Design a protein around this ligand. Structure first.
Ligand code: IKD
Length: 311
């Protein structure tokens, strides 16, 4: 797509592409463009199906003013959901592409991870809390993410200290108009998600519900703290991963307590996974209890620490 190509979204706002960075470009509004881009445009084929799933999520859930009301009521410094500005179709060389105009963000956490994709314990716990805030909000709004992992956490651009959950490509409306999906194992559609982190429900082909996002976040924090998960050697074998995950949850808390090196306790992560595994399929997580598990002293959250000293 040429720099300067002008996109018109469904609301009739016009967007001029910048430089590429699927395909993702800097973007500016035609009307009152700032020096510096605060928007990006994500582009994919119209048939491109994950972008459409994303569009549904963002259009339904990422309402700037609703988030603003939530942040204020819940006393959050921020919520790690990127803002959504518009969507539409554009044509280039005979084909029609769907695009979404999104808040500009910075670097993904996979890139800025230390030794063997690890973060300092304080950073792990804070990331967990920030994600619980996102989960509570999207869950309240009938959606689950299904794919929390470092590559889908991005730091802000305009605010580089804030962390954002992105890529709602596997997001799922689990409770459309308050009707919670039924539990059904589909043995034709098992083992979806990122195999390293996906939930047992996903392994069994069960429609994602709230507990699955909490479970996945638990696997993530264990991976971020300890540096590799018990199934590291099994990733090309989904069944074996399922088995390893089953055993880990079945043998909590010790499965997790034992895994940790002498430095970094998994006490918080163990109890987190205990809480997560206690949930019924249609059950609402105790997000406040979970946040407290990760922040036992109730410290204010401060800068994320990505330092690498000595490695
Ligand atoms: C390419 C770059 C990372 C510099 C980036 C991303 C954004 N902004 C937004 C806003 C909403 N959704 C997305 N998707 C998204 C998710 C993850 C990655 C990277 C990995 N893994 C890229 C894009 N991006 N601005 N700049």
């Amino acid at each position: 797509f040429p720099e300067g190509k002008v996109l018109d979204d469904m609301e009739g706002n016009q967007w001029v592409l910048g430089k590429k960075i699927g395909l993702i470009y800097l973007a500016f509004p035609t009307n009152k463009p700032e020096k510096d881009a605060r928007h990006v445009v994500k582009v994919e084929y119209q048939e491109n199906g994950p972008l459409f799933s994303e569009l549904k999520f963002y259009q339904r859930v990422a309402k700037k003013d609703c988030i603003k009301k939530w942040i204020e009521r819940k006393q959050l410094d921020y919520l790690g959901i990127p803002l959504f500005y518009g969507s539409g179709l554009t044509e280039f060389k005979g084909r029609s592409y769907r695009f979404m105009v999104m808040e500009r963000l910075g670097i993904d956490l996979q890139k800025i991870s230390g030794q063997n994709g690890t973060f300092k314990k304080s950073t792990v716990l804070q990331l967990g809390i920030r994600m619980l805030d996102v989960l509570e909000y999207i869950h309240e709004n009938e959606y689950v993410h299904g794919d929390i992992k470092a590559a889908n956490l991005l730091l802000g651009y305009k605010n580089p200290d804030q962390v954002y959950l992105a890529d709602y490509g596997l997001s799922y409306r689990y409770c459309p108009n308050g009707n919670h999906k039924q539990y059904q194992e589909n043995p034709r559609k098992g083992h979806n998600g990122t195999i390293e982190f996906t939930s047992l429900d996903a392994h069994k082909g069960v429609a994602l519900s709230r507990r699955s996002d909490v479970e996945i976040l638990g696997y993530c924090m264990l991976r971020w703290l300890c540096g590799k998960l018990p199934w590291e050697q099994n990733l090309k074998d989904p069944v074996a991963v399922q088995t390893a995950k089953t055993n880990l949850l079945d043998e909590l808390p010790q499965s997790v307590l034992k895994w940790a090196p002498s430095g970094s306790s998994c006490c918080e992560i163990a109890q987190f996974l205990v809480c997560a595994h206690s949930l019924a399929y249609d059950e609402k997580p105790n997000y406040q209890a979970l946040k407290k598990i990760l922040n036992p002293h109730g410290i204010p959250l401060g800068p994320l620490d990505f330092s690498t000293k000595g490695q």
